């Protein structure tokens, strides 16, 4: 009902339509990306600095680290929205890597509609310190996007890109896209 065809528009980039949204995957350094929102995969204290979270907090800077700890002490948060710091984005959304990945992605999509944002870039959420299985993570990320499109919620969001640190995890995402294609 929603899926287009898997192709490669650029070297190392694989894409398919899901309703109105262009879904893309690539391996690389997520801190080099430009998007309205970049997603960080962190701990329930919002102060993990290991793997992708290390790279994101180091590049974003100390003011973003300060924003995270200030919000963490104010209430119990499922996720936190900060400025982008010295990353090339308007906001960072910091999600908990051990949480249900479909729920986390659904929340990111809804927050991006609230701000009239068009582009999102995320890592393979939960595959680092949380040690969630790569094919379960791939299935959950793509399922969240399908549900968002099925409900007619996609209006401003046009592009969702997963930039993945390990090439072996990229290969798992590509196989999941091929399973779904029209
Ligand atoms: C050995 C690993 S796994 C991993 N996952 C995410 N980010 C990383 N960076 C860039 C620090 C790493 C490194 C260097
Ligand atoms: Cl993680
Ligand atoms: Cl990753």
From Swiss-Prot:
Domain of life, source organism: Eukaryota
Induction: Up-regulated by IFNG in macrophages. Down-regulated by IL4 in macrophages.
Domain Macro as annotated: residue spans: 10-181
Binding sites annotated in the UniProt record for a glycoprotein 3: 29-30, 41, 52, 126-130, 165
Subcellular localization(s) per the UniProt record: Nucleus; Cytoplasm
UniProt PTM: Auto-ADP-ribosylated.
Tissues expressing this chain: Expressed in macrophages.
Subunit (UniProt): Interacts with STAT6. Interacts with PARP10. Interacts with PARP9 in IFNG-stimulated macrophages; the interaction prevents PARP14-mediated STAT1 and STAT6 ADP-riboslylation.
Function field: ADP-ribosyltransferase that mediates mono-ADP-ribosylation of glutamate residues on target proteins. In contrast to PARP1 and PARP2, it is not able to mediate poly-ADP-ribosylation. Has been shown to catalyze the mono-ADP-ribosylation of STAT1 at 'Glu-657' and 'Glu-705', thus decreasing STAT1 phosphorylation which negatively regulates pro-inflammatory cytokine production in macrophages in response to IFNG stimulation.
Family affiliation: Belongs to the ARTD/PARP family.
Protein's recorded name: Protein mono-ADP-ribosyltransferase PARP14
Organism: Homo sapiens (Human)
Gene for this chain: PARP14
Residues shown, of full length: 1208 to 1388 of 1801
């Amino acid at each position: 009902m929603f899926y287009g065809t898997v192709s490669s528009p650029d070297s190392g980039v694989y894409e398919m339509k899901i309703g109105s949204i262009i879904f893309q995957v690539a391996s690389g350094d997520i801190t080099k990306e430009e998007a309205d929102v970049i997603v960080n995969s962190t701990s329930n204290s919002f102060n993990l600095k290991a793997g992708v979270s290390k790279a994101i907090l180091e590049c974003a800077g100390q003011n973003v680290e300060r924003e995270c700890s200030q919000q963490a002490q104010q209430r119990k948060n499922d996720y936190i929205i900060t400025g982008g710091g010295f990353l090339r984005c308007k906001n960072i959304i910091h999600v908990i890597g051990g949480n249900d990945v479909k729920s986390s992605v659904s929340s990111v999509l809804q927050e991006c509609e609230k701000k009239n944002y068009s582009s999102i870039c995320l890592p393979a959420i939960g595959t680092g310190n949380a040690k969630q299985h790569p094919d379960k993570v791939a299935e959950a990320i793509i399922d969240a996007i399908e549900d968002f499109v099925q409900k007619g919620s996609a209006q401003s969001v046009k592009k969702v890109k997963v930039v993945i640190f390990l090439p072996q995890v990229l290969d798992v995402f590509y196989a999941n896209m091929k399973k779904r294609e029209g």
